[PDB]
Subunit: 256 residues, 4 copies
């Protein structure tokens, strides 16, 4: 595969519907060796089953709200992977109250704090912690959403965290590029996942996109995963700091 | 002038070089009634002097890091301006350690938290706090920098904070527009100010910019203040959720 | 007013609904001296009436499809305004066949040629033709549409023409800035005008926009003219090579 | 390869340094069947040698300035490829005089005409002519440059043609998407090619980029070709109307 000889760490696999899950499959189909992290014990065993299917016995607990957790995970990771080639950051979070109705009324200081910390900061946090274990030709990838670029109803403060994140991709890419590390983001169209269910009228959001999207269908985790495998492979060597839209063309069309 | 009948609240006047200062002067020259806030005790009397000069005797304290301070300032404001027509948010802050050398190495969880809290959240926190005192036709304004859109050396996490901020403008503009409130931002080119001194080799920025800028000069606080008065007056009724670049054209040129 | 002492040349007044008309009115309300051009004989007397009303008796013919017409208009202009302070380019055209149904099927080599020639080239052709009559502090302005940035149904090749136009603003701003000339564009939201009637289901555009627009209303020629007066006055000294959106916020929102 | 079972037509191979050449290699390495066009007889035999190496005996003359030439080529193409899966548009042109010094002085009506016609229109022209021979899952790709987004010295009118083109990708993608056709663009960093030699100080342009680019090197046709193979493969199914930057990160960095 085009990822043969690559060791990539994959975050965010909550279930078989997760973008991370679809991403690991594409990467594994492409010859990459994978390592998975699980946020907690509620998720532990599940992630272990998926690791096994993708031929990996590296499943480490990691909660990006904690520096020491990121730190410990990388330590256990180095035991098998002293040096690796990148990671996939598929982690996003905002307190439930943050996501519905008028943004100005919903947003609070803490919610803003948590949303930016978990969705934006965690990306660089993970980079700091493993920066020295990365081989040249490494690539990091995170997942963003159009709410970063446009004011989308109910997405509220998550739109700001995503905007922060995209700026992170640029700052990381400019800082880590000179040492052989690329950093990019896939701006994915809406996909029904556990987290998606936290946004009001997601079902109508999906149907809308399916209708107004040039390709005339919503994207799949297979679609996203394929772009992800590419962005983390040497095939995308000339791309860094880029936010690739994998939404079928939705954001470029208008009043369809 | 074109702001006659407008009562505007101006924040961030730390000195006669402050962008907020240059903005207050233009808004005063165009007929507006102003109210000033000062962050702390160190700045108080300085702000009172300028206020007096701009014919205002409404100088209230406000530390945007504290909700209670934001809430009290508006209660105090209500006593004189039960209803007013918008405010200028000219506040920014990132801990000193954050602003120099490699981004990834420089950034920390608290620096990120703080940079975002003071540079981005505070904007919406203020809007929430006075949402009901705003008259139809009200305009809210904030100041951003190109760091939001491009990875600029040393600007580091402040670029991420601005990215979040510009997103905020869009989400606030979308949320408040329905009740008669516009929200926009001026993306100002570099200007030597108190806070400007906190970035490495700023002197070279200013000169680099002066040379590669289409208008061939760096912008002024007079420049920025005229655009801000415009953006907080009825002259800009057709504009909302916009980040206008008052950088003399610097960002649209390349390899000049 | 803020344009007192400014002599501006206004193009594209086809009627009292014309954006150029609403612009001329604001520029006149702010103290500017205007000069008007009319495309042909059919429009001549109409333009003379408005001119007279806006206190001007300088009405010259100008078909931007002909260099010689552009050259003669300026020679005639020189006789009264040897030097002036900029002009408003409010001219757009694509053959009728170009504007409806599927883009690819609708577009032809000549329609493309024409749409670009009249909607984009003409802007720089006029600047070339008067480059030496422009005083320092001069401003050039043009009008664009969101079609440049997003694929909008039926707008077809005109969107490509606008894309070329917005690029022109940037290249002209960069080239002329050094001699004291700023060049910008207003990206106006839909407004019912003579040319507006040439697009399919425009009535539904206007209503769709009125509903999904942050300010909850479509912009007016008054709205656009105040932003244009601002952009052609010294109030916008810090702005050049910029495409300001006077669409009430429509483009920054999504799935409203 | 990931392009196995794909028949792609490749335009623009002038020499072994051509972006098209590097693109065909990547596509051929990935299992795709290719067909090549040559603009003229000066180029004919050369393109035939490259076709042979890439295992293709389909080399058709095509000059995109002529509808009948595009038309005839597709007719001869259908003889072997009744239906195919897409094409690579790597064609750009502007009269020599257009490319040096002050844009406003260099640009002329004809130069603008030719530059837009050959660099922008030809893309859709080719799409019109073959629209019905495309299988579902087809993808078209064109090559753009940052001069479309920023005013780059000496690029002059080519920057406008590229802006027109990028708008074309969006219009094409929105029109052809519903029938199973994606349209995208690679915005390539500077690469020394025959055409490149038409831009003043290209050598200094290259060195600059190599220094200020996050990856710290200029891109290669291998880099571009790899992204091209991906954008024309089912791997990029969720991407359409996108302008992917393959420039190492140059456009996202600032004042490096
Ligand atoms: N699904 C969509 O429609 C969509 C579209 C664009 C982008 N995204 C992004 O893709 C990523 C994956 O989202 P998803 O939709 O697949 O949902 P998901 O629920 O499958 O995955 C969310 C993941 O984030 C993890 N996470 C959150 N907080 C954590 C923490 N504190 N520490 C460690 N892990 C934590 C959860 O365990 C989970 O594995 C998110 O960034 C999301 O914003 C989603
Ligand atoms: N100066 C530049 O070149 C430039 C360019 C682009 C953007 N900006 C932005 O303009 C705004 C004003 O900054 P400036 O350059 O005029 O500098 P300045 O130092 O004169 O003012 C910044 C203001 O921030 C206030 N502030 C800091 N923390 C705050 C808090 N906790 N509570 C209340 N107020 C707070 C300070 O009192 C100060 O008045 C900032 O957002 C800045 O990022 C400046
Ligand atoms: N009306 C809208 O909703 C809207 C929105 C965005 C952009 N625009 C732009 O505003 C500008 C003015 O158009 P409008 O909507 O006011 O319509 P309008 O029909 O009132 O005016 C367009 C003008 O184009 C002039 N024109 C056409 N070909 C020209 C030529 N060959 N020589 C000289 N002049 C030429 C006509 O005389 C006419 O005055 C156009 O660029 C248009 O694309 C309009
Ligand atoms: N090389 C770079 O630095 C760079 C960067 C970004 C984008 N691009 C684009 O890539 C494409 C390929 O450029 P290149 O740099 O490889 O140069 P090149 O000289 O190898 O290729 C240019 C091709 O366009 C063809 N062409 C031009 N007019 C033609 C016509 N009338 N009909 C048919 N074919 C014609 C020429 O035969 C040639 O094959 C162009 O669009 C160029 O703008 C180049
Ligand atoms: O960002 C997303 C965008 C869409 Cl359309 C759907 C799901 C998304 O993902 C999230 C949304 C809200 C929270 Cl709290 C956490 C996550 Cl992971
Ligand atoms: O944002 C700015 C951009 C420039 Cl070019 C100059 C000064 C700026 O203002 C700040 C920079 C850093 C911090 Cl800590 C706080 C502020 Cl207010
Ligand atoms: O650009 C426009 C955009 C909108 Cl929404 C409405 C009218 C416009 O104006 C034009 C549209 C088509 C052609 Cl043929 C010429 C012009 Cl002047
Ligand atoms: O677009 C380009 C951009 C760069 Cl940096 C280098 C070469 C380019 O390609 C061209 C430039 C000018 C002409 Cl007339 C034709 C072509 Cl193909």
């Amino acid at each position: 595969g085009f990822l043969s000889g690559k060791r990539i760490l994959v975050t965010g696999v909550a279930s078989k519907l997760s973008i991370a899950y679809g991403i690991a499959q594409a990467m594994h189909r492409e010859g990459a060796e994978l390592a998975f992290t699980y946020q907690n014990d509620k998720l532990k065993g599940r992630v272990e089953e998926f690791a096994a299917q993708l031929g990996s016995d590296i499943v480490l607990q990691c909660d990006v709200a904690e520096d020491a957790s990121i730190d410990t995970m990388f330590a256990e990771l180095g035991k098998v992977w002293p040096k690796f080639d990148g990671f996939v950051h598929s982690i996003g979070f905002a307190p439930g109250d943050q996501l519905d109705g008028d943004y100005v009324n919903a947003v609070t200081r803490e919610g803003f704090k948590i949303a930016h910390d978990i969705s934006s900061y965690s990306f660089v946090a993970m980079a700091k912690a493993c920066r020295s274990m990365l081989n040249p030709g490494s690539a990091l990838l995170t997942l963003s959403y159009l709410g970063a670029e446009r004011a989308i109803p109910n997405y509220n403060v998550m739109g700001l965290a995503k905007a922060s994140l995209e700026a992170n991709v640029r700052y990381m890419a400019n800082a880590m590029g000179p040492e052989g590390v690329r950093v990019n983001a896939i701006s994915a169209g809406p996909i029904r996942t556990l987290a998606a269910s936290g946004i009001k009228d997601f079902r109508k959001m999906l149907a809308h996109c399916e209708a107004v999207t040039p390709i005339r269908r919503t994207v799949t985790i297979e679609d996203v995963g394929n772009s992800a495998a590419f962005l983390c492979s040497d095939l995308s060597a000339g791309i860094s700091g880029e936010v690739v839209h994998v939404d079928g063309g939705f954001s470029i069309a208008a009043m369809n």
